[PDB]
Amino acid sequence: SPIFGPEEVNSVEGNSVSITCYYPPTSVNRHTRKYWCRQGARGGCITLISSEGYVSSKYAGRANLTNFPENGTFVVNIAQLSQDDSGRYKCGLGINSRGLSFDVSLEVSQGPLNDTKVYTVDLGRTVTINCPFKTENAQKRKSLYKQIGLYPVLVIDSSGYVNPNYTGRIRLDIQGTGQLLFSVVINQLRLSDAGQYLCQAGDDSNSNKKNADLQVLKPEPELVYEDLRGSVTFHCALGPEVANVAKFLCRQSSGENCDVVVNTLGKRAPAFEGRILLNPQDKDGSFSVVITGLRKEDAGRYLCGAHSDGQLQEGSPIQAWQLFVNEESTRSPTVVKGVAGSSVAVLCPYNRKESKSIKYWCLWEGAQNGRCPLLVDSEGWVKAQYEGRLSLLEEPGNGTFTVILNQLTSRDAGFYWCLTNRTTVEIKIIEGEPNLKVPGNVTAVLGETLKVPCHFPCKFSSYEKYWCKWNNTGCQALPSQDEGPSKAFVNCDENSRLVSLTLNLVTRADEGWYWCGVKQGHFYGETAAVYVAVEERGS
Ligand SMILES: *[C@@H]1O[C@H](CO[C@@H]2O[C@@H](C)[C@@H](O)[C@@H](O)[C@@H]2O)[C@@H](O)[C@H](O)[C@H]1NC(C)=O
Ligand SMILES: *[C@@H]1O[C@H](CO)[C@@H](O)[C@H](O)[C@H]1NC(C)=O
Ligand SMILES: *[C@@H]1O[C@H](CO)[C@@H](O)[C@H](O)[C@H]1NC(C)=O
Ligand SMILES: *[C@@H]1O[C@H](CO)[C@@H](O)[C@H](O)[C@H]1NC(C)=O
């Protein structure tokens, strides 16, 4: 609510754009996470760029985000715009999922148009297109067109025409109290409904027009991992808004067909006789389906959906899972201990032939849950919550890669998978303290030089020592200056060390995460992380 920005933004393929977002310049908000993210299925919003150093590969070289804590604003710059950039976005503070954000529309045309808003909506759901007009057209014909074949085709008229493909699921809502707009409400959106729409009031040269870019999204499959002859539970959570529409669970085919495993109209596929359970539905309209005695053949894409006949159809809301059924092989989870405020360096083995495959590190949640939600991969992705504290390195290589997680707490205790295209790791948090020693709340000042200490015990004297800035593609090493020993340790004086990171002329882009760390050839170890902030006056 408190966040402001441009609600409509229009551009041309090739140009560039500068979106400015305003926020309350509270103490917290000054260096809190700024994010620019794109709206996706099911309310999701995918980080495209953040103030923590994360930059989507889709924005690599193409975009930047500059904070202005004095103004109370930050500015997202995007260049080399493509039509692919047309969409709905949020600019915000904190984490994408939380509230503090503002909703931005971005449209990109091929050459030079008009007032254009983007709508982004899930399959099967409703959209409301608002169509504004001037008083001189308030009692003339209201229309909605769709560009079908570079031809505007009438979808609905105030004269009573409704296009055959929309009948029964479209209405033209005339506002009361003399407001100067009408709305078109479209239900049960289909993939085919996506496209370019034209709102029109009047039929004159005096006509009032608005462009609407309607996007209709398929859902993202949730991944589920289960063992042969084990069970799985699908929690189907469509709206309360469809709680009274018949539900189905079905399995996707090589074809476009999606054959029903279970129904609320009596269908229960023979393959699943005696091992399928359709549980009752919530007051939320959500329900679950349980499958036992899994066969390898049971693995695939599953949709649960709502449609009056109990079958998958166009314009039906849906939810997706990808199921994996794997053999029970012959092993216990390798265990790694770390201590709060410090770090781990977990070695993940992969099969040497799968060397250029993608590696994954994810949090495993137990066989019934079935899900192992990703935290980081080898392609520059990182979960938002883990920006500045998590990386996946290809070193040492040749059958092994490293996951570095730091800024530890008790919360991080749990089971993790190393994945490729496998290895379970239990992280335990024990009483102890970090060997490396770093300041917490560090603040440089614009144009001035800053230097930042890191203390290394004697333990690490023959280790290689580094400073680097953290981004999501990799921690980049910096000029550090080896300085004299340090007295911050016990049973240590001469062998210990202090290594300093020096930032000679601080720019606004020097803000973000810096890691102090330790290394032995290609085998990485402990790290310590410090956030460098940037203001401009002095203190
Ligand atoms: C926000 O500030 C940006 C950078 O500037 C600071 O404030 C202005 C008023 C000047 O004194 C400048 O020298 C300072 O470093 C500007 O580039 C931007 O236009 C400003 N915009 C808003 C809305 O505050
Ligand atoms: C924003 O990106 C452009 C390239 O499109 C780059 O030249 C510019 O320096 C960037 N902004 C900042 C503040 O570095
Ligand atoms: C349904 O409408 C679309 C345009 O939205 C059109 O292209 C398509 O051919 C129509 N299909 C049928 C079966 O009428
Ligand atoms: C991120 O790391 C890459 C090296 O992989 C480097 O080229 C790039 O400049 C870094 N990004 C920033 C914003 O420093």
Numbering used by the authors: 2 to 113, 116 to 333, 336 to 426, 432 to 549
What does the literature reporting this entry say, word for word?
Protection is conferred largely through the function of the polymeric Immunoglobulin receptor (pIgR), which transports and stabilizes secretory antibodies and also functions as an innate immune factor. The transport cycle of pIgR starts when pIgR at the basolateral membrane binds dIgA or pIgM, and the resulting complex is transcytosed to the apical surface where proteases cleave the pIgR ectodomain (now referred to as secretory component, SC), releasing it into the mucosa as a complex with dIgA or pIgM. SC specifically protects secretory Ig from proteolytic degradation and confers innate recognition functions upon SIgA and SIgM, allowing them to bind and exclude bacteria. Here we report the first crystal structures of intact SC proteins, comparing the highly-evolved five-domain human SC (hSC) and a two-domain teleost fish SC (tSC), a relative of the first vertebrate SC ancestor.
The crystal structure of hSC was determined to 2.6Å resolution (Rcryst = 20.1%; Rfree = 25.4%). The final model (540 ordered residues of 549 total) revealed five Ig-like domains (D1-D5) arranged into a compact triangle (three sides of ~70Å, ~70Å and ~90Å) in which D2-D3 and D4-D5 form two of the sides, and D1 contacts both D2 and D4-D5 to form the third side. The overall arrangement involves extensive interfaces between all five domains and a small solvent-accessible hole (~14Å diameter) in the center. D1-D4 each adopt an Ig-V-like fold, which typically contain β-strands A, B, E, D on one sheet and strands A’, G, F, C, C’, C” on the other. D5 topology diverges from the canonical IgV fold because, in common with both the IgI and IgC folds, it lacks the C” strand and associated CDR2 loop. We observed partially ordered glycans at four sites (D1 sites Asn65 and Asn72, D2 site Asn168, and D5 site Asn481), which do not contact protein portions of hSC. An unexpected and likely functionally significant feature of the hSC structure is the large interface (1480 Å2 total buried surface area) formed between domains D1-D4-D5. Important contacts between D4 and D1 that stabilize the triangular shape of hSC include a salt bridge between D4 Glu392 and D1 Arg34, the last residue in D1 CDR1. The keystone in this interaction is Asn482, whose side chain is located in the center of the C-C’ loop where it forms hydrogen bonds with the main chain oxygen of D4 Gly385 and the main chain nitrogen of D1 Val56. His32, Arg34, Glu392, Asn482, and Glu521 are conserved in mammalian SC sequences, and Arg34 and Glu392 are also conserved in reptilian, amphibian, and avian SCs. It is notable that conserved D1 residues His32 and Arg34, as well as residues in D1 CDR2, are important or necessary for binding to dIgA and pIgM, yet also stabilize the D1-D4-D5 interface and are largely inaccessible, while other putative ligand-binding residues in CDR1 and CDR3 (e.g., Tyr24-Asn30, Arg99-Lue101) remain exposed.
